[PDB]
């Protein structure tokens, strides 16, 4: 069956000229809504939430991990270190790491987090141990954000992120006191007013990841809690065909807008 919303999507799919993903999971009746929900997108950035969150999963048996240092030196900082590169020759903490990688999007910050998990394999293995069956890792920073059309490298589908981030921001995949501190830092987020969130009322209160790459790719994942209702998990994906494509941050905000119609 095609739905109004889904029709809706196609067709703003169709003006967009790329690919769009989406899958919502609204949590009062657990139903959902999908758009090309089991087709692989390059997750970019997004990734960042499943990273933190295996982190947050090792603290839950050390205490003192989130406060533990680590050495920032020059020859690691990449494309995009915001937070990190005032750190150079000094350290931060994985606490440190896992905001500056959630709510600036620094990569240094992922590719430590990537590191303290034993690479990017460490990453996915966390994804198996909750549920998910779908996300891969396979690199670091800042090539895990190529986003080739068919390359199936640190992709998922959008059904299976949703799944996912529900479980780790409103389920039982983290310890109650991590899943709070997750929570915290995607509120906390300052890269996301253009994305999924400028498509709700902007009074709905949300937490989200964005994520940019190649492709022109743009997406954002996202909690939120509606007024007056249950929260909702949406996920949005997008990419594009030619290689130097422009962000259309705009698409996932029209698409968050369909959904939210859709209500
Ligand atoms: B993540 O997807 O937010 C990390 N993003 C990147 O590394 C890319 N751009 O990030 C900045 C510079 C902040 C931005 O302009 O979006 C990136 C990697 S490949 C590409 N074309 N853009």
Redesign the pocket.
């Known amino acids: 069956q095609t739905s109004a919303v889904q029709q809706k999507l196609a067709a703003l799919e169709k003006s967009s000229g790329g690919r769009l993903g989406v899958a919502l999971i609204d949590t009062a009746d657990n139903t959902q809504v999908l758009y090309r929900g089991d087709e692989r997108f390059p997750?970019?950035?997004?990734?960042?939430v499943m990273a933190a969150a295996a982190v947050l999963k090792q603290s839950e048996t050390q205490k003192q991990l989130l406060n533990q240092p680590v050495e920032i030196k020059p020859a690691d900082l990449?494309?995009?270190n915001?937070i990190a590169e005032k750190h150079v020759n000094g350290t931060m903490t994985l606490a440190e790491l896992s905001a500056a990688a959630l709510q600036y999007?620094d990569?240094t910050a992922?590719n430590k987090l990537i590191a303290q998990l034993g690479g990017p394999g460490g990453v996915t293995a966390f994804a198996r141990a909750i549920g998910d069956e779908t996300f891969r890792l396979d690199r670091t920073?800042?090539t895990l954000?190529?986003?080739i059309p068919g390359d199936p490298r640190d992709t998922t589908t959008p059904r299976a992120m949703a799944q996912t981030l529900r479980q780790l921001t409103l389920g039982h995949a983290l310890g109650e006191t991590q899943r709070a501190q997750l929570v915290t830092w995607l509120k906390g987020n300052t890269?996301g007013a253009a994305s999924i969130r400028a498509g709700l009322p902007t009074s709905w209160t949300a937490g989200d990841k964005?994520?940019?790459?190649?492709?022109?790719?743009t997406?954002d994942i996202a909690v939120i809690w509606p007024q007056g209702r249950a929260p909702l998990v949406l996920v949005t994906y997008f990419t594009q065909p030619q290689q130097?494509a422009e962000?259309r941050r705009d698409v996932l905000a029209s698409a968050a807008r369909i959904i939210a119609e859709g209500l």
């Open positions: 997750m970019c950035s997004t990734s960042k990449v494309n995009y915001p999007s990569n992922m920073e800042p954000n190529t986003a890269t964005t994520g940019s790459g190649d492709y022109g790719t997406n130097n962000s």
